[PDB]
Structure 1
Amino acid sequence: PREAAAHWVPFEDKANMPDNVPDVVEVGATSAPLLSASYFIGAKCKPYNDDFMLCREESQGSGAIDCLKEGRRVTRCAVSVIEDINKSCLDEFRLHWQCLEQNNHQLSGCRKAEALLNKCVFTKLNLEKKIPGLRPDEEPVFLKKDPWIKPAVDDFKSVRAYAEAKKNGTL
Structure 2
Amino acid sequence: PREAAAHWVPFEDKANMPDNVPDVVEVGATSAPLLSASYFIGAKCKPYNDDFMLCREESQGSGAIDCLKEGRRVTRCAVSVIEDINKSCLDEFRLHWQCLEQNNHQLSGCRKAEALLNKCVFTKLNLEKKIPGLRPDEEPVFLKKDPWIKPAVDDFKSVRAYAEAKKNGTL
TM-score interval, normalised by the smaller of the two chains: over 0.9
1:4-31 Cα shifts (integer Å, max 9, x gaps)? 1210000001100012111111001101
**Secondary structure at 1:43 match in 2:** helix
1:100-156 Cα shifts (integer Å, max 9, x gaps)? 000110111101111011110001101000111001110000011100001111110
Aligned-residue offset at 1:61: 1.5
1:26-56 Cα shifts (integer Å, max 9, x gaps)? 0011010010000000000001001111000
Determine the C-alpha separation between the residues in 1 that align with 2:36 and 2:54. 26
Aligned-residue offset at 1:59: 1.3
1:55-92 Cα shifts (integer Å, max 9, x gaps)? 00011121111011111111100000000011011100
| Length, aligned pairs only | 171
Determine the C-alpha separation between the residues in 1 that align with 2:97 and 2:152. 17
Where structure 2 has 5 or more consecutive residues not aligned to the other structure, the ranges are none
Structure 1 segments (4+ residues) deviating >2 Å: none
RMSD of aligned residue pairs (Cα, Å) = 0.6
**Secondary structure at 1:125 match in 2:** coil
Tell me the percent identity: 100
Cross-structure match for 1:22: 22
**Secondary structure at 1:71 match in 2:** helix
Cross-structure match for 1:93: 93
Determine the C-alpha separation between the residues in 2 that align with 1:21 and 1:85. 28
TM-score by length of 1: 0.98
